[PDB]
Amino acid sequence: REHWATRLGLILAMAGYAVDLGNFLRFPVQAAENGGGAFMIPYIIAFLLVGIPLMWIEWAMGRYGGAQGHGTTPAIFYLLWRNRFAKILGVFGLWIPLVVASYYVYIESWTLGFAIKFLVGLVPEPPTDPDSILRPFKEFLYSYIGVPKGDEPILKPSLFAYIVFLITMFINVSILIRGISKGIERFAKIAMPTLFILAVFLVIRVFLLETPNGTAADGLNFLWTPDFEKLKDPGVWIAAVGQIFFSLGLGFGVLITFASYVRKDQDIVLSGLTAATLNEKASVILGGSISIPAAVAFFGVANAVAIAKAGAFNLGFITLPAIFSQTAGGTFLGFLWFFLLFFAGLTSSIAGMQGMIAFLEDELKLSRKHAVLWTAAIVFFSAHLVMFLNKSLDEMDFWATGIGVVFFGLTELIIFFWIFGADKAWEEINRGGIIKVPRIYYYVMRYITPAFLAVLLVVWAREYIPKIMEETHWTVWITRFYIIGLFLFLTFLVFLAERRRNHE
């Protein structure tokens, strides 16, 4: 089996995964909408009671199975719980990231496209007035995505977008085909620094942004000024518990699969705690000092509310480009911004797509090459649904993430800590650890953590399930029909896996 070459490269791959566009975009938005500085209170809390424990747990389940030559949750869940239902419940941890990758790699391509489009100077140039600057970059984005001009639920992306996508894929395979050490880790050693460099440089430039409407200081102020009145709202406490899940990226089986390339007795307690610290430092410091300040700097603090309600997506592909088109030589900032996001995704997309490669390697005994190419073929195929069918993207994200984090996460907990046994698990977590997990985390892992996930499951099931189930168009069934067909397919490979093992 393959293994990590360096302790650093491990943390950098892990942090490479965890570090998102979400750090630079989703995280700052969630803050401003839910108390600003006050959002840190429920955020830090859920970071200790939920994010930190589960992190160790996925890491633990990973190494526990990874020693036994099994990186995927179909196998691992069978080892923690030797049941027929455990393999099935484990299929999700192979189904969840595959579905997400069916659109993430595509979204990742946009950045590369936009980066190229911004580098060569092929960008809209306005014209004064806010809508008279945003609309050119609002339409620029729609041409790339291929947003429908008719009632039809049919996207028609530009030929260039498609080409960049293939290129983007080709980039992913290029790193993936070189294994864990000479590929992901080797790249994580290059990407993570390159990422930090761009972040700071942007942050610096952003702080030097002065417009008639305001300054960057006004953005940091608005963002970090704590409105505690919103902490009374349960919705803030929920949006917090989820945001951490999203930022750390738990409940996708990726941490598990990654931690399955960790040797049997190498530390996972501190290693994970470090990668987790890197991601969150990146969010609050870097990410929360580029977008929101630059937005507030240009559109005043008056629109700082309206900007936040405009969704993170707009801020990154419409608002921030349109802002850069006005600054001194900002066509290069556009290139720097997008290329920053490109890597942020590229360090993650290679990570998530490894879970499938590992499955074919471990269970179906495929070479790394074949496991890589076939996985690329599956993701490339599915992506056409997201590329061409409208709102297919959102449907995939809704199910794979919305459910996949809340359901599979609480599944990882009960299987490893309640079924496999708390004590046997607690030792499996602390084992090899340079430091030891505090004794109090035993109660958090066993009672407090699943208490939160449980409350989270209930609130989610009431609010989000009746919405997508009726009010939506009929083409959502096509997306549903497809993603269901994937789970049924992975059920068949899991079946083929166990039938190949009884023979030998």
Ligand X SMILES: CN(C)CCCN1c2ccccc2CCc2ccc(Cl)cc21
**Identified binder of ligand X from the candidate list 319, 327, 349, 449, rule CB under 6 A:** 349
Residues numbered 59-98 forming contacts with ligand X, rule: CB under 6 A? 97
By C-alpha distance, which of 240, 265, 258 is closest to 431?
265
Residues with Cβ within 8 Å of 216's Cβ and at least 6 positions away in sequence, in order, are 206, 207, 208, 209, 210, 293, 294, 296, 297
Q: Would you count residue 341 as binding ligand X (CB under 6 A)? A: no
Stretch that binds ligand X, among 158-166, 317-325, 345-353, 362-370 (CB under 6 A): 345-353
Q: Would you count residue 348 as binding Na ion (CB under 5 A)? A: yes
Residues numbered 265-294 forming contacts with Na ion, rule: CB under 5 A? 279
Q: Would you count residue 353 as binding ligand X (CB under 6 A)? A: yes
Instruction: Give 140 or 339: the residue with its C-beta nearer to Na ion.
Output: 339
Instruction: Give 101 or 336: the residue with its C-beta nearer to ligand X.
Output: 101
Q: Would you count residue 348 as binding ligand X (CB under 6 A)? A: yes
Q: Would you count residue 320 as binding Na ion (CB under 5 A)? A: no
**Identified binder of ligand X from the candidate list 77, 104, 258, 408, rule CB under 6 A:** 104
**Identified binder of ligand X from the candidate list 43, 224, 252, 261, rule CB under 6 A:** 252
Q: Would you count residue 261 as binding ligand X (CB under 6 A)? A: no
**Backbone discontinuities in the chain, residue before each (C to N > 2.5 A):** 127
Stretch that binds ligand X, among 101-109, 157-165, 291-299, 464-472 (CB under 6 A): 101-109
3-state secondary structure 51-108: HHHHHHHHHHHHHHHHCCCCCCHHHHHHHHCCCHHHHHHHHHHHHHHHHHHHHHHHHH
Other beta carbons less than 10 A from residue 230's beta carbon = 17
H helix runs in 431-475, sequence order: 441-443, 449-463, 465-470
Nearest-angstrom CA–CA distance, 42 and 234: 10
Backbone angles phi, psi at 29, to 5 degrees: -60, -50
Tokens of 474: 């009929």
Least distance in Å: CB of 277 to Na ion?
A: 12
Instruction: Give 290 or 344: the residue with its C-beta nearer to Na ion.
Output: 344
Amino acid identity at 160:
F
**Site size for ligand X, by CB under 6 A?**
16
Q: Would you count residue 55 as binding ligand X (CB under 6 A)? A: no
Instruction: Give 20 or 58: the residue with its C-beta nearer to ligand X.
Output: 20
Least distance in Å: CB of 33 to Na ion?
A: 17
Radius of gyration of the chain from its Cα atoms, rounded to whole angstroms: 22
286 contacts which partner out of ligand X, Na ion, none, CB within 5 to 8 A by kind?
A: none
Residue 84 known to bind ligand: yes
272 contacts which partner out of Na ion, ligand X, none, CB within 5 to 8 A by kind?
A: none
**Identified binder of ligand X from the candidate list 136, 157, 242, 249, rule CB under 6 A:** 249
Residues numbered 388-407 forming contacts with ligand X, rule: CB under 6 A? 401
Nearest-angstrom CA–CA distance, 378 and 26: 28
Binding mask 213-232 for ligand X (x = CB under 6 A): --------------------
Tokens of 482: 């497809």
CB 173 within 8 A of CB 373: yes
Q: Would you count residue 257 as binding ligand X (CB under 6 A)? A: no
Instruction: Give 239 or 415: the residue with its C-beta nearer to Na ion.
Output: 239
100 contacts which partner out of Na ion, ligand X, none, CB within 5 to 8 A by kind?
A: ligand X
Least distance in Å: CB of 462 to ligand X?
A: 22
CB 366 within 8 A of CB 177: no
By C-alpha distance, which of 43, 45, 81 is closest to 61?
81
Least distance in Å: CB of 176 to Na ion?
A: 14
406 contacts which partner out of Na ion, ligand X, none, CB within 5 to 8 A by kind?
A: none
Least distance in Å: CB of 195 to ligand X?
A: 12
Amino acid identity at 122:
L
Distances (CA, A) of 340 to 112, 115, 335: 10, 9, 8
Least distance in Å: CB of 25 to ligand X?
A: 11
H helix runs in 1-39, sequence order: 7-18, 21-24, 26-33
104 contacts which partner out of ligand X, Na ion, none, CB within 5 to 8 A by kind?
A: ligand X
Least distance in Å: CB of 346 to Na ion?
A: 7
Distances (CA, A) of 437 to 269, 277, 442: 7, 16, 9
CB 116 within 8 A of CB 127: no
Q: Would you count residue 342 as binding ligand X (CB under 6 A)? A: no
Residues numbered 209-268 forming contacts with Na ion, rule: CB under 5 A? 247
By C-alpha distance, which of 175, 94, 98, 164 is closest to 379?
98
The residue nearest ligand X at its CB is 352
H helix runs in 146-290, sequence order: 159-176, 186-207, 216-224, 234-248, 254-258, 269-281
Tokens of 49: 């009671």
Nearest-angstrom CA–CA distance, 106 and 396: 13
Instruction: Give 171 or 425: the residue with its C-beta nearer to ligand X.
Output: 171
Residues with Cβ within 8 Å of 388's Cβ and at least 6 positions away in sequence, in order, are 154, 155, 156, 157
Site residues (vs Na ion, CB under 5 A): 18-20, 23, 247, 279, 344, 347-348
Binding site for phosphocholine: which residues?
84
Residues in contact with ligand X by CB under 6 A are 17, 20, 22, 97, 100-101, 104-105, 249, 252, 254, 348-349, 352-353, 401
Pick out the residues of the known binding site: 84
